[PDB]
Symmetry: D2
Subunit: 394 residues, 4 copies
């Protein structure tokens, strides 16, 4: 099931969580960068080797092994960072790991693995429906030695971070000899390149997410980068984005299971601390049944997350397409519902700064959109099902 | 069936909304945006004042109060629906919460002195008020849990307790508080007027809703009551009458929120359809993706259902009073917030990432509806009351 | 609101229900025709004038007036018949009333109004998706004096009834000079015409519905009818079906409100007669909340039914298109849910012959399909909404 | 992780299903159809017998019982899923309810004489049995309500009471009943073997499920117990042990139903996709209407969820026993029937009018799943148990 290394590392992560991270929550909870405790915590994690756990080729962990670890990190908003496991940097690391040239890795992959710099992924554009990636019009043109980039991007997570020195950008390479689906490319763009302008931060229900901060509109005004900044090859844009978003999708879902287990904990502590109409709240059967329904949902999605991870292990993330889609739909909406019941049990306190539930709700709502909206994944599953259904009849 | 006056005033409100209020939205929003989460800005820009004055001149003012407006509850429901389409519209006609409820409490139960002193300034929009019932340390959905102490020595009352979620306390104009506390007796609760500048009243901190502080109506505060002494004549109606008065005020409170919510929904669906026609994904406009189409249709169905149920309730209040319409108010209080919540959430989804952003009012709209499943009584509590009432009526008929 | 006549007639229907119909339920409940009591009951209704109430031009009732009456009939499975208000005969009467020639009315409309014969509507075909009416391929061809009909029809309700002497049939009149949407016609076909063959009955969850009996596959094998049997004109098929199904749709929904009010009654009687875990069942809060949710749903749909009726009164059934669609979607699924909770409260008894809930569930499930499936109505509403939404911006 | 034997036997079952069982479905159905609602036909056509014999020869028999099959619960779950795709498949491998539960009750608690007399013939498929717990006159979901009287005079027991929903009683082979009654004592319930031919046992009437009588497994009966006398040695295990034994049997009962339901669902989704490709409406195949597409996708998601949760539960039973897996069995008992119910209902909708007709197995499939939200314990009861267990585990960890 789990590997022996996987079991040991999980045990180590749990200890670290209980003994260092969680005791630091109060303070960290109570400007687009991170307080010094985050740094001391990172250093400690490095020493005990709890670092880059998300990357098999470095961690020596299977995706099954990591799922249980990632679940644990999901119980705390700054946990993934401490182990260098946070988005959008994990996906960006994977992109370079799988497709980067040797020069590209020496320059960017190494610093990222070290936690020296951060990065942002730039795909979504305000002026076009970006859920259909073929709509992307951010222009990339080629003169002999270099590429010129022009366009608008938004929702770039993490751009506010002064350490964010590098951007991975998806654009159109208009080419008349290639087909409609081979019209896009991925290119490295250093944040300090002339013509790169960060315009404004974007809120999520009036959170700005300063801590991971944040989410930005970035314009690309005549930016020139060396041809050697292109990733893999011209026309390979969609391929690379599929390569990175597969893990991206699954890491978010693993974390969500931990999020949910935290919500249900908060829900039960609360339902026992409050007397209304001469009964503790858990004695009102409707509240009881929310607790129960939440337990059922968590088990279902943890299992479906594990199934997906196990597919990746044995098929690679392309071959696990269907299972990743399934968990990407299931997880955020189920956990969203759990958080919302938890908020309801907490009364007015549920929407307040006094609990982490309102934040938790914002995170889960957004995951029905980020890394691809539910509806898009559902259509992909329907297509895939109808193919498999056709196969079994041949 | 609407009244003739009701029809005329509705027409007037529509012609004010289109011609004055809505064209001011762009600017008022730019003000709301810059001041959200401000430590110190809890009031309104001058346009709100100019707008209020204009409304006074045309008589569009205090429309929510029959004994002043000469309007039925049915008449107002349609009007309030229209105000719901803009976050500052109810204020312009002096129809905003928590002030409408507080005014009604004084109108029905206030002594002549109490009215002359507080009801009058509120009716002019000179001051504002806040209602103080909810307490952090006890489950306040069961009102009998309220422990905020009220004790009596001859000429006065002494008040000690904690209150929170007091809406509007941050606005400097908020000079008066209506408070619910325990008056221990044999053989438990009272409502009392407390001026905000009374020694011992301390405003502790603002409270956020998904990280919105609601500065514009601002906002929602924890208030402590530390040995505050008020005149015995500040008591409303009588000792032991707390629950009665809160029922008296929250009935309309509940229904006014629902009426506004119908307008909120209609606005979401408009935003949803404009958007669904402006975006091409996978070689179609988004409304051509049948799943989106069916959210539009499901929305229309839900609005019609809840508008009618709002009207049914209003019509009950007209012919039964708000005590006799208990059941119908409960029904709409449950139905409306959750339905419109769902409509807003689909509208957000249709808008993509923009739907949670500051570029649309949907994220705010969602927060408002979410909070209405809690404020003025949580769904679960109203459901239980309906079940009890249903089983009584069910017993009656057999 | 209601008219004075409407109020009086409702009062009369309630009395009749309580005093004659309902006391007969036991027996009628405890072969495709009806027992003699049904006949004696019909005769009594005629004498007191409680007959054809569904038809304004005869009853002098508004659609609002009838909605409340139809609601009352919905509380008993044989009630609509007693007042001559049952489908498919009401729709068939309306079709002749609005579009029949004088000869056609003298021959068919009169007997039906009298309750002497019954009729069936034949639109749905097994071999094509009949929810898109343009798919209908049942052939209608013309030689000089007469029409020849060839095709298959199924789900013809009431065909088993020995009194069913007449069929209203929707077929294709292939005509090269008309457009795709003008290719269909409606034609009267007497059941005893050579070439008309009733093939087999169809069950609904293994009910055959003998009482209204039933639902049949009918084949049309070279049937010849006089040209004067055509309704209104060649090419007008869709128009006539819209003309008849509008009321059809709304009458079914009115009846459903009464059905629901019966289910909730059964649910509450039961929830008070049963002690489980030391409490009556209504004291288990989850059961309480089903009762409450059911009350809420009934009020919503009764109101939406009334809104629809009131539109018909003031706009005609074409102009009320949108409101009829809205209630057609809302009603059957909501009431379906109420019946299903009622079944759950009744335990094993809920699915049994000992209650009318299992039948009630079958009726409501089927109304999500008959007179047009939910999905089709939802699409129509979306189209209409987007038009109205466009209007308000001009 | 499956065992090697488990893998081999699964392969065999698949190769029997495709080659013998499924090709017999057409005919067996024609038999089911003609005999549904028959007053007097409660047994099975001869092909079922030939099929049973063939299975015996290849060893595909009693697969549900580890101590005989040598299979783990995980191993069987996959097998039972396969049986679920055909209404007569579990019988062919002697894996049908209520007989599997009754066999387990004797296997775990039966005395040597009891086994030799009843367990043996059942294991051969010579006789059948029925379980008698539910009583019409009391809410039987709370087992302590059972009033069916059992009294003791020296050498024997006297039984008086009403029972209903006794599945299979109509089949002539049903020679034995396992009965739960009250043994009044201080300081309440017992299980007792009752042969069907005992004087005083009267089968009253069959019960329908949406007007299906279930003749094939036939069927479900009300049985009265009018002064029936049995030997004291007919008691199972001991006086006072009723609840224990019912828990002992219903644990597997619950889980076997769920495993079969996964196969039921997979069959619905297959029917749904074949249909959605065979019908053109509004110029598209039905799967091209995005709403239908999303029901297909939602179905796939639900199946994977419940299969995994079934496997999790099975794996618990393997490592904890069925008492120690209480929680996980409860979870799957709630989750499975309602999810698959929804899948079947969407499949019906996709099929149009045909979906409620005798031309498809969907209407039957719906009835089966609906009944599983009641049988072996209603959802609501299992939900409450989960809540209680969750709050205990939640207390443990803190
Ligand atoms: C907190 C947050 C962080 C983000 N971080 C990043 C980032 O780091 N990098 C980045 O490139 N982007 C990022 N995004 C944005 C993002 O991923 C997109 O918003 C998402 O992919 C949808 O793009 P869109 O806003 O253009 O929606 P649109 O393309 O305009 O579509 C909007 C809605 O249409 C519907 N829809 C689309 N197609 C179909 C269909 N076939 N059938 C039925 N319905 C359909 C969906 O409901 C969809 O949400 C982030 C977004 C949020 C909220
Ligand atoms: C934006 C906002 C503005 C507000 N403004 C005001 C104001 O102006 N004045 C004021 O006095 N208060 C105000 N409040 C707060 C308020 O009304 C309460 O939060 C709410 O009514 C319940 O109080 P509580 O937090 O104590 O919930 P609790 O009483 O602790 O109960 C918590 C949860 O238990 C559940 N529950 C309770 N009883 C039952 C039952 N019998 N059966 C099943 N479930 C049950 C409910 O789901 C409930 O939400 C405001 C709140 C918000 C969010
Ligand atoms: C109890 C009962 C009585 C009946 N009585 C009559 C009668 O008296 N006369 C008569 O002519 N018919 C009658 N019918 C049948 C009937 O009305 C049809 O079955 C219904 O119109 C659908 O036709 P169909 O069976 O061909 O479904 P299909 O056309 O093959 O379509 C099946 C399913 O496709 C889906 N669908 C269709 N279009 C869309 C879309 N645009 N988008 C998304 N989903 C879509 C729906 O879910 C639909 O149900 C009766 C049916 C029942 C169950
Ligand atoms: C097809 C079929 C086959 C069957 N076969 C058998 C058999 O072979 N042997 C046998 O002994 N029985 C059998 N039964 C019947 C059976 O199991 C019962 O019907 C069921 O377990 C409950 O019994 P009841 O009808 O008395 O429901 P009740 O006990 O009267 O309770 C009714 C409803 O109340 C609700 N409820 C109960 N407790 C609570 C609570 N604490 N909180 C909230 N809600 C609550 C539930 O929703 C429940 O369904 C069969 C039933 C069917 C439909």
């Amino acid at each position: 099931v789990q590997t022996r290394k996987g079991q040991e590392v999980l045990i180590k992560v749990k200890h670290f969580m209980k003994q260092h991270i969680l005791p630091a929550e109060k303070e960290v909870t109570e400007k687009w960068g991170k307080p010094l405790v985050i740094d001391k915590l990172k250093e400690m994690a490095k020493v005990e080797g709890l670092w880059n756990l998300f990357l098999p080729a470095v961690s020596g962990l299977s995706h099954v092994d990591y799922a249980l670890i990632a679940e644990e990190t999901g119980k705390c908003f700054f946990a993934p960072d401490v182990f260098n496991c946070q988005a959008p940097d994990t996906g960006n690391m994977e992109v370079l790991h799988l497709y980067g040239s040797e020069e590209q890795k020496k320059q960017w992959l190494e610093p990222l693995l070290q936690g020296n710099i951060t990065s942002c992924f730039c795909m979504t554009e305000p002026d076009v429906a970006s859920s259909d990636a073929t709509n992307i019009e951010c222009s990339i043109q080629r003169d002999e030695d270099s590429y010129v980039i022009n366009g608008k991007k938004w929702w770039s997570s993490g751009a506010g971070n002064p350490k964010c020195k590098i951007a991975i950008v998806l654009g159109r390479t208009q080419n008349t000899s290639l087909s409609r689906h081979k019209q896009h490319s991925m290119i490295l763009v250093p944040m300090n390149t002339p013509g790169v302008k960060i315009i404004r931060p974007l809120s999520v229900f009036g959170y700005t997410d300063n801590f991971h901060g944040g989410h930005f509109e970035i314009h690309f005004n005549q930016v020139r980068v060396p041809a050697t900044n292109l990733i893999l090859g011209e026309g390979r844009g969609f391929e690379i984005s599929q390569g990175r978003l597969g893990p991206g999708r699954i890491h978010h879902c693993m974390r969500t299971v931990g999020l949910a287990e935290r919500a249900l904990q908060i829900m039960c502590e609360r339902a026992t601390q409050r007397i209304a109409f001469k009964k503790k709240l858990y004695a009102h059967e409707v509240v009881a049944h929310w607790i129960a329904e939440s337990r059922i949902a968590i088990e279902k999605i943890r299992l479906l997350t594990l199934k997906a991870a196990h597919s990746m292990d044995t098929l690679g993330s392309a071959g696990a397409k269907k299972e990743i889609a399934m968990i990407k739909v299931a997880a955020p909406r189920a956990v969203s519902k759990i958080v919302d019941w938890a908020i309801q049990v907490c009364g007015g306190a549920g929407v307040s700064q006094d609990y982490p539930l309102a934040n938790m709700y914002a995170i889960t709502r957004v995951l029905r959109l980020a890394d691809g909206p539910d509806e898009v994944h559902l259509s992909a599953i329907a297509t895939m099902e109808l193919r498999d259904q056709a196969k079994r009849l041949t």
